[PDB]
């Protein structure tokens, strides 16, 4: 089906992740010591802020850190953590 | 408590006031110094320049009275109208500025970093070492390339950076933190 | 000269063909490899993946025949329609891809750089030094911060970078070159 | 922008430039080794692509390189060259 997304599965599997569930296009849970919620972002494919915020919220609900799996137009995969910050008062204020 | 509006910045000519602003929030920059430390402030006698967001914030708080070129007081709402006229997204950006400042963070220009703001706990120098804050404008989506770009702007080995936006529906300021994941 | 459309990229399973594409202008990437040298090619035995812009370009040039999942030919027109519907600004960005490619330059993903494309004369790898190409989308202006950002994305000590855009009114691709001036 | 623009003049003077002519809001000619056309850009203040193209074209018309003087919201100045590229065909292109 989708060779770019497939590159993500292959990559994670190569380092001992198990794929637990696919929730949607682009969204899946996988595990290696802790479960993470993955969101695949293909180069050139824009998503709305609302979509991103929703995925981030899903993570909070499910109690799982969110990882964006970035995929280049020809299959290179790079991972970023993302979270919604709750910025505390500065201690050194 | 006076500063003068001259274009898109405000200049404080009362050096004793200038010093108080800088030692009490690291507001502004002295010409032509930089990375001024608090303890070298007293031996500085130069004017202080405040950016429009800084000046507006201080006016709101009211730690500054801004005087225009015709000798009028320029009220907060006047400052904001000027910003809105000249700077795209001023209102949203100011909200972000104020968000960080109200929580006790030092907010400075992000230009040097290619970003909206640089945000500090203690002060630029010294030490430690800015959080790079990138703006997400209205109506704009996000893609993978935005994320790696932020990572590049980062000065951390972890490639950590923050995305700031204001949600149109609610006006909520929303900050997202990103960092490289070596999975 | 077959490749297989699978989502938003095309896979070439014919290795001898893949080697030719790679030799004849550094099209695509071999799975499991990067920056493969032109000589090193003969001892690679891996599929080649082609990004959509690459595949479209080669298809238009009659150098690639693309097959869909149903086993039918996908014409250049259908490839473009797929890109347009999934990727914002496809048409404009392809125009830019083509501009560089028609002039003989190797045009590669910009993702690692936080940019639209990375552009080479001799390719990866190498030797070496890609031009970082940043996109100016429709109906958008430019600010000081955009310029310093590009400077940060650059891998040159001169902070050199290229802005690419398509002019609304004329359709002209316009390239601007920026670099840090030490005055 | 009185003051921000003035920061640019002060900085160039410090660097041994002389100001030759003010052409406009934000456009001027100054000289050190050669003459350059300067365009001042303030942090936060957007300028259309047409505007920038016009300035670049003026430099071509006047025969002078163009320098963008970038000014932070509190008066720090950084300079970039800008030009319109005329991209040559790539001599190193592989045979097809």
DSSP assignment of D3-71, as one string? HHHHHHHHHHHHTT-EEEEEEETTEEEEESSSEEEEEEEETT--B-HHHHHHHHHHHHHTT--EEEEEE
Q: Tell me, yes or no, whether C70 and C104 share the same domain.
A: no
- CATH number (domain holding residue B39): 3.40.1170.20
As beta bridge partners, residue D71 has D42, D77
Q: Are A and C touching by the rule of 3+ CB pairs within 8 Å?
A: yes
B108/B10 Cα distance (integer angstroms): 15
Instruction: Say yes or no for a CB contact (<8 Å) between B148 and C114.
Output: yes
HSE at residue D58, side-chain half, CA atoms within 13 A, is 17
Identify which of B172, B170, B174, B171 has the alpha carbon closest to the alpha carbon of residue B162. B174
Residues of chain B with Cβ-Cβ distance to A83 below 8 Å are: 176-177
Q: Does B159 touch chain C (CB under 8 A)?
A: no
Per the omega criterion (within 30 degrees of 0), is the bond before C181 cis?
Answer: no
- Topology of domain A1-93 in CATH is Trna Endonuclease; Chain: A, domain 1 (3.40.1350)
A3/A10 Cα distance (integer angstroms): 10
State the SS3 of B26-58: CCCEECCCCCCCHHHHHHCCCCEEEEHHHHHHH
Q: Which residues contact A74 (CB under 8 A, 6 or more apart)?
A: C9, C28, C29, C49, C50, C51, C54, C109
For residue B137, give the chain C residue with the closest CA.
Answer: C140
State which residues form the domain around C24.
1-88
Backbone angles phi, psi at A37, to 5 degrees: -100, 120
Residue C123's region, left for phi above 0, alpha for psi from -120 to 50, else beta, is: left
Active-site positions of B?
A: 120, 128, 159
Domain boundary among B25, B55, B88: B88
B69/C178 Cα distance (integer angstroms): 36
- The domain limits of chain A are 1-93
D80/C145 Cα distance (integer angstroms): 12
Q: Tell me, yes or no, whether C62 and C130 share the same domain.
A: no
Residues of chain B with Cβ-Cβ distance to C133 below 8 Å are: none
Q: H-type helices in A1-93, by residue range?
A: 3-14, 49-62
Domain boundary among C88, C122, C147: C88
Domains of chain C: total:
2
User: Is residue C119 a contact partner of residue C148, using CB atoms and an 8 Å limit?
Assistant: no
Q: Tell me, yes or no, whether B64 and B149 share the same domain.
A: no
Q: Tell me, yes or no, whether B124 and B145 share the same domain.
A: yes
B21/B2 Cα distance (integer angstroms): 11
Query: What is the CB neighbour count within 10 angstroms for residue B104?
Result: 15
DSSP assignment of C73-123, as one string? EE-HHHHHHHHHHHSTTHHHHHHHHHHHHHTT-EEEE-GGGTSSEEEESS-
- Topology of domain D1-96 in CATH is Trna Endonuclease; Chain: A, domain 1 (3.40.1350)
- CATH number (domain holding residue B149): 3.40.1350.10
Instruction: Say yes or no for a CB contact (<8 Å) between A45 and C87.
Output: yes
Q: Name the DSSP letter for residue A32.
A: S
Instruction: Please name the member of D45, D46, D72 whose beta carbon is closest to the beta carbon of B109.
Output: D72
Q: Tell me, yes or no, whether B48 and B74 share the same domain.
A: yes
Residue C128 annotated as catalytic: yes
User: Is residue A55 a contact partner of residue A39, using CB atoms and an 8 Å limit?
Assistant: yes
Backbone angles phi, psi at D38, to 5 degrees: -100, 140
What was the structure determination method?
X-ray
DSSP assignment of chain B, as one string? -EEEE-SSEEEE--HHHHHHHHHTT--SEETT--S--GGGGGG--S-EEEEHHHHHHHHHTTS-EEE-TTS-EE-HHHHHHHHHHHSTTHHHHHHHHHHHHHTT-EEEE-GGGTSSEEEESS-SSSSS-PEEEEE--TT--B-HHHHHHHHHH--STT--EEEEEE-TTT--EEEEEEEE---
Q: Does C95 touch chain B (CB under 8 A)?
A: no
HSE at residue C16, side-chain half, CA atoms within 13 A, is 1
DSSP assignment of chain C, as one string? -EEEE-SSEEEE--HHHHHHHHHTT--SEETT--S--TTGGGG--S-EEEEHHHHHHHHHTTS-EEE-TTS-EE-HHHHHHHHHHHSTTHHHHHHHHHHHHHTT-EEEE-GGGTSSEEEESS-SSSS--PEEEEE--TT--B-HHHHHHHHHH--STT--EEEEEE-TTT--EEEEEEEE---
Q: Does B162 touch chain A (CB under 8 A)?
A: yes
| Options C120, C122, C140, C155, the catalytic residue | C120
Question: How far is residue D62 from each of residues C180, D20, D29, D35, D41, measured CA to CA in Å?
Answer: 22, 13, 10, 10, 20
Task: Give the long-range contacts of residues C19-24, CB within 8 A, separation 24 or more.
Answer: C19/C44, C21/C48, C21/C50, C21/C58, C21/C63, C21/C64, C22/C48, C23/D94, C24/D94, C24/D95, C24/D96
SS3 call for D85:
coil
Q: Please, what is the end-to-end C-alpha distance for chain D in angstroms? A: 55
Residues of chain C with Cβ-Cβ distance to B88 below 8 Å are: 141
For residue B149, give the chain C residue with the closest CA.
Answer: C114
Q: Tell me, yes or no, whether B78 and B154 share the same domain.
A: no
Distance from CA of A79 to the nearest CA of C (A): 12
**Neighbours of D (≥3 Cβ pairs closer than 8 A)?**
B, C
Domain boundary among C72, C88, C104: C88
Instruction: Say yes or no for a CB contact (<8 Å) between A73 and C6.
Output: no
User: Is residue D81 a contact partner of residue D66, using CB atoms and an 8 Å limit?
Assistant: yes
Q: Are D and A touching by the rule of 3+ CB pairs within 8 Å?
A: no
């Amino acid at each position: 089906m989708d060779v770019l997304q497939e590159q993500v599965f292959k990559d994670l599997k190569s380092r001992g992740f198990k794929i637990i569930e696919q929730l949607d296009d682009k969204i899946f849970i996988a595990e290696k010591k802790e479960r993470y919620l993955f969101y695949v972002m293909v180069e050139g494919v824009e998503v709305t802020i609302q979509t991103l915020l929703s995925v981030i919220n899903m993570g909070e609900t499910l109690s799982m850190p969110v990882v964006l799996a970035l995929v280049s137009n020809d299959g290179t995969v790079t991972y970023y953590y993302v979270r919604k910050i709750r910025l505390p008062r500065n201690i050194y204020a | 408590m006076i500063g003068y509006l001259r274009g898109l910045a405000v200049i404080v000519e009362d050096v004793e006031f200038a010093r108080r602003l800088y030692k009490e929030g690291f507001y502004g920059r002295f010409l032509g110094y930089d990375k001024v430390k608090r303890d070298e402030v007293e031996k500085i006698n130069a004017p202080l320049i405040l950016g429009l967001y800084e000046a507006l914030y201080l006016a709101e708080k009211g730690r500054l009275k801004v005087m225009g070129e015709d000798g009028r007081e320029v009220a907060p709402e006047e400052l904001a109208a000027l910003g809105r006229e000249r700077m795209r997204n001023f209102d949203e950006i100011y909200k972000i500025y104020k968000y960080f400042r109200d929580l006790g963070y030092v907010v400075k220009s992000g230009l040097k970093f290619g970003a909206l703001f640089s945000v500090y706990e203690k002060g630029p120098g010294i030490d430690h070492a800015p959080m790079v804050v990138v703006f997400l404008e209205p109506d704009k989506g996000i893609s993978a390339t935005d994320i790696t770009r932020g990572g590049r702007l980062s000065h951390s080995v972890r490639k950590t950076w923050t995305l700031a936006t204001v949600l149109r529906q609610t006006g909520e300021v929303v900050l997202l933190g990103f960092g490289w994941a070596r999975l």
